[PDB]
Amino acid sequence: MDPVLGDVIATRIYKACFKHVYGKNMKAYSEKDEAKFDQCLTSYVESYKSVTNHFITYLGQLPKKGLSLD
Amino acid sequence: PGEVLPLRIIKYPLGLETIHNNIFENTNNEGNVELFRLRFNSNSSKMQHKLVQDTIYLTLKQKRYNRKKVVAPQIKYYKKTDLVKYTGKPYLSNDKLLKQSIYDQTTQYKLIKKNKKRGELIPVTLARRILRTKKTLVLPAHVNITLITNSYDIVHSWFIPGLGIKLDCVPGRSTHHTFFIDNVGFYYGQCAEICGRYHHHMPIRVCALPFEHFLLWWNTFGLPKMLNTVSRKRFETHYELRKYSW
Amino acid sequence: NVEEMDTIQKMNYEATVNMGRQDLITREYTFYSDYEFIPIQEDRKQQMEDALNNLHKIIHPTVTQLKKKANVQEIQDRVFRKLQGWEGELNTCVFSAKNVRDSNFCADRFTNRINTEGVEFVKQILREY
Amino acid sequence: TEVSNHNYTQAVAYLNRATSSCVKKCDSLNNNGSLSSKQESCLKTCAENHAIATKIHAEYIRKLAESKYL
Amino acid sequence: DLPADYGKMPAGYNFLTRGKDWREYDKDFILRTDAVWEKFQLEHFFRNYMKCFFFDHGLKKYQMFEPEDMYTVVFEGWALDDLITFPGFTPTGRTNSYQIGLSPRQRTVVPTQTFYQMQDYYMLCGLRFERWFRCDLVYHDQRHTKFDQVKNQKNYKTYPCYREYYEAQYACQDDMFDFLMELAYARRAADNFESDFASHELTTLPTFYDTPKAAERKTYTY
Amino acid sequence: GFETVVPAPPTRDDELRMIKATEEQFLQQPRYKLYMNEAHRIAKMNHGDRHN
Amino acid sequence: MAQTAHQNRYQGGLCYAQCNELFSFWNPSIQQCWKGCDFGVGRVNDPEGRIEAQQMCKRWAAELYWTYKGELDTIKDLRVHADMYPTTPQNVYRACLAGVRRQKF
Ligand SMILES: [Cu+2]
Ligand SMILES: [Cu+2]
Numbered sequence: 001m002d003p004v005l006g007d008v009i010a011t012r013i014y015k016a017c018f019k020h021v022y023g024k025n026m027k028a029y030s031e032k033d034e035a036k037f038d039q040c041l042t043s044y045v046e047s048y049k050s051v052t053n054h055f056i057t058y059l060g061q062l063p064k065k066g067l068s069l070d
Numbered sequence: 071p072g073e074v075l076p077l078r079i080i081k082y083p084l085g086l087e088t089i090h091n092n093i094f095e096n097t098n099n100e101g102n103v104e105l106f107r108l109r110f111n112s113n114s115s116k117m118q119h120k121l122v123q124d125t126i127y128l129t130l131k132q133k134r135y136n137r138k139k140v141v142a143p144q145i146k147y148y149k150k151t152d153l154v155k156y157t158g159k160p161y162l163s164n165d166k167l168l169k170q171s172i173y174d175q176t177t178q179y180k181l182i183k184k185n186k187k188r189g190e191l192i193p194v195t196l197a198r199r200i201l202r203t204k205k206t207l208v209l210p211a212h213v214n215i216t217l218i219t220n221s222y223d224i225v226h227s228w229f230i231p232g233l234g235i236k237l238d239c240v241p242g243r244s245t246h247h248t249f250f251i252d253n254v255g256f257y258y259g260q261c262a263e264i265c266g267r268y269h270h271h272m273p274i275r276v277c278a279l280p281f282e283h284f285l286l287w288w289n290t291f292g293l294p295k296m297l298n299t300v301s302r303k304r305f306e307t308h309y310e311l312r313k314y315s316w
Numbered sequence: 317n318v319e320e321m322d323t324i325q326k327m328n329y330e331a332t333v334n335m336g337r338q339d340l341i342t343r344e345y346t347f348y349s350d351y352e353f354i355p356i357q358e359d360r361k362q363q364m365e366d367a368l369n370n371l372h373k374i375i376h377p378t379v380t381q382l383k384k385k386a387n388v389q390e391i392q393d394r395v396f397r398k399l400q401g402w403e404g405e406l407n408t409c410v411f412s413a414k415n416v417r418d419s420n421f422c423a424d425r426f427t428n429r430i431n432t433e434g435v436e437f438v439k440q441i442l443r444e445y
Numbered sequence: 446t447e448v449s450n451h452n453y454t455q456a457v458a459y460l461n462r463a464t465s466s467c468v469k470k471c472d473s474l475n476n477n478g479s480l481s482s483k484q485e486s487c488l489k490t491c492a493e494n495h496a497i498a499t500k501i502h503a504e505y506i507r508k509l510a511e512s513k514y515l
Numbered sequence: 516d517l518p519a520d521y522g523k524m525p526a527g528y529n530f531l532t533r534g535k536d537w538r539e540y541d542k543d544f545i546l547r548t549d550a551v552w553e554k555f556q557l558e559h560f561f562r563n564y565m566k567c568f569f570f571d572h573g574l575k576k577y578q579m580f581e582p583e584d585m586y587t588v589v590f591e592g593w594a595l596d597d598l599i600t601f602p603g604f605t606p607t608g609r610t611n612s613y614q615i616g617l618s619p620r621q622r623t624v625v626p627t628q629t630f631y632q633m634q635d636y637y638m639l640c641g642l643r644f645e646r647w648f649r650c651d652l653v654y655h656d657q658r659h660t661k662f663d664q665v666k667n668q669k670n671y672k673t674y675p676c677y678r679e680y681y682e683a684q685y686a687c688q689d690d691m692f693d694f695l696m697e698l699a700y701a702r703r704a705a706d707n708f709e710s711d712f713a714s715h716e717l718t719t720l721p722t723f724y725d726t727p728k729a730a731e732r733k734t735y736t737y
Numbered sequence: 738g739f740e741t742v743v744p745a746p747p748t749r750d751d752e753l754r755m756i757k758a759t760e761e762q763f764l765q766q767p768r769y770k771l772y773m774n775e776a777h778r779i780a781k782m783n784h785g786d787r788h789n
Numbered sequence: 790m791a792q793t794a795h796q797n798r799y800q801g802g803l804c805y806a807q808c809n810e811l812f813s814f815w816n817p818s819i820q821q822c823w824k825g826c827d828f829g830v831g832r833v834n835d836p837e838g839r840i841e842a843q844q845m846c847k848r849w850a851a852e853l854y855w856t857y858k859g860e861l862d863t864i865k866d867l868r869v870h871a872d873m874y875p876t877t878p879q880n881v882y883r884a885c886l887a888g889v890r891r892q893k894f
Pocket of ligand 1: 263
């Protein structure tokens with residue numbers, strides 16, 4: 001892939017963090033908002049890692065050829 | 071042709087099993103005797119995998135004995151680690167001892183082939199010219215062995231003269247013939263039917279031995295073969311010697 | 317697991333997996349000329365299996381108590397003829413079905429037929445035998 | 446075997462969409478940086494469901510294309 | 516006999532025979548006057564007949580080869596082939612000298628007496644193959660889910676067509692079995708049950724075995 | 738198909754009674770009617786009488 | 790009759806004739822009932838003899854065909870049909886029991 005994919009993912013994560021912080025609470029920005037955004041980013045990274053692991057496993061678990069195992 | 075019907079109703083066979091006098095073979099998870107079963111077709115366009123050839127027959131290919139080119143030395147490899155763990159050229163001494171051959175075995179074989187003296191009453195057991203074969207059918211004595219005789223191409227005839235038997239293996243005909251050897255011995259025979267080009271040399275060797283000896287041969291060469299496992303002796307052969315006992 | 321097995325046991329596990337996974341390989345090759353039929357839904361299969369299980373549960377007392385293989389086979393044959401007529405009607409509706417709505421309707425009709433009239437037929441047969 | 450960068454990009458986009466769906470469903474953002482036990486279970490379930498859904502949708506698109514061609 | 520526990524095994528009976536006086540049993544045995552020559556002849560015969568292995572010196576161990584013709588052993592001893600290690604008669608060292616008999620015959624589903632008059636089992640092989648194919652087609656799909664082909668090895672149930680397949684293989688030969696297997700593969704692809712095409716039942720003469728109340732046909736008596 | 742209660746295995750007295758009845762039936766056969774001693778002998782004799 | 794105790798069925802005796810009456814003319818059950826009657830020689834007249842004869846018949850049936858332990862005891866119908874061919878160990882046991890029961894004196 002290219003870094004543009006990472007940029008798009010970052011933009012999506014930023015939109016998600018804004019929704020999580022200011023989706024229903026439209027207030028002034030502060031260090032509390034920054035910390036909330038950092039926590040949301042950490043949670044998003046963990047969720048992405050878990051989703052990738054589970055999806056790769058389920059897609060890796062689905063049989064596609066006879067088990068050879070050499 | 072056509073297609074698989076979406077749903078089919080099948081009645082499971084009744085009375086097929088009499089192991090425990092339980093004529094009800096199929097019982098659902100509810101425990102009720104399952105008399106009818108519904109078989110549904112899933113993929114309309116999918117084909118069907120061919121039935122697995124469940125038959126595994128230990129094949130001994132009895133062919134005519136061939137001339138030896140050069141006497142090779144018995145080379146055993148390490149461990150597949152082709153390094154020669156063991157090397158030698160044995161010779162069966164008069165005491166039936168596989169001692170170390172001190173002469174040139176190739177020279178001995180070549181000289182024997184070049185010139186062998188003959189006698190007016192030389193035993194046929196000591197003079198085999200069109201009766202030597204690679205493998206001999208190893209069987210026990212004083213027992214009933216059924217032989218299913220069959221031909222692959224044309225009707226051949228296996229005639230054991232010492233046993234006085236003559237089985238005509240013909241195509242299509244699975245001739246189930248009994249054999250009871252009331253004595254332990256080794257017998258030689260040839261094709262009693264003109265088989266074509268090799269109607270002269272189609273030797274058959276039959277060795278009937280004590281049941282202990284037949285079992286030993288089976289355990290050392292037959293049990294090891296047709297195992298469908300790793301070819302290691304400690305993995306199959308000993309395993310067979312640890313799995314099967316009479 | 318596989319790493320916890322010896323050579324023979326690993327070979328046996330591979331044998332079982334391959335023999336069970338044949339259809340997946342058979343999922344590859346298809347013949348175009350065949351008239352494609354929409355498969356019956358898993359819910360419909362489950363409902364039909366439940367109806368068959370109810371029928372088997374009903375049969376269980378008479379089947380277990382009977383001491384005649386001939387009588388068991390006769391009861392099974394009568395029930396099989398009736399259910400075979402019903403299933404033939406259902407399959408005829410299924411083959412010509414053009415939509416999942418038609419598939420569901422045919423499945424519901426077959427299940428109701430097994431539920432309603434087949435029960436009376438089985439009850440009468442059991443009362444006779 | 447080898448794979449193409451276009452395939453990698455498609456897989457990355459599918460993973461991003463699945464992660465977004467899982468976060469929105471399981472409310473993964475409402476955490477202090479560590480997913481709860483229920484959050485992780487829901488993440489695994491939703492990731493498996495999304496992988497199955499991606500496979501099914503790809504198969505459906507391919508089958509529509511084939512039926513158009515065939 | 517006098518003790519009330521005569522014949523009961525003593526507790527912790529080591530069964531060892533160390534330090535046993537052999538004189539007490541001398542009257543319990545009668546030895547032939549030719550016992551010495553008998554022992555010598557028995558030892559010679561046991562050595563000559565049982566020892567079917569050759570003491571190979573290169574590996575300094577017992578060895579064995581496939582049975583060969585006398586001349587092949589006599590005049591062609593310089594070219595022995597396929598020599599392996601003699602593993603021994605028994606893994607535990609027990610003897611193998613016992614008269615053999617016929618094992619209890621396996622159960623029969625398609626009796627050989629149906630066409631036992633014929634020498635070649637052609638019709639018998641055909642009938643056995645038809646029955647085995649019917650049973651297989653009945654239980655083909657559940658072999659991997661409910662039979663010995665299951666993954667849970669502790670849940671392995673013998674296939675319903677086990678005895679049928681064994682009898683069919685016994686009756687039929689290799690080439691005929693292969694041809695019938697191809698034909699049965701075509702039949703399974705067709706999924707054509709014998710009951711889905713049978714109309715020959717109409718054009719057969721009625722028989723006393725085909726009465727309507729078949730259950731009443733049998734007259735069971737003890 | 739209604740089933741009946743299976744009678745218990747017979748005692749020696751019942752066996753002797755059955756033997757006596759069978760002996761009487763065997764002796765009852767006329768010498769002129771050549772019918773082989775088989776499980777279907779009685780039905781065959783009845784059919785032969787009907788045919789006569 | 791190779792397993793029987795008489796040179797000919799005529800030398801078998803009335804019970805053997807009774808055996809010929811038991812089953813159809815196309816079943817080895819005739820030979821099985823002849824063997825069962827041969828097991829009943831001097832055993833039917835005594836109760837212990839009859840019990841031992843039943844046990845011996847079970848033993849012979851087990852030696853005939855490979856049978857599991859207890860299956861011969863799980864037999865529900867000791868009654869036999871004239872069309873019962875000797876195909877199963879249960880059938881062998883039933884035929885032997887019938888032959889023993891059909892032996893007089
Ligand atoms: Cu030939
Ligand atoms: Cu020839």
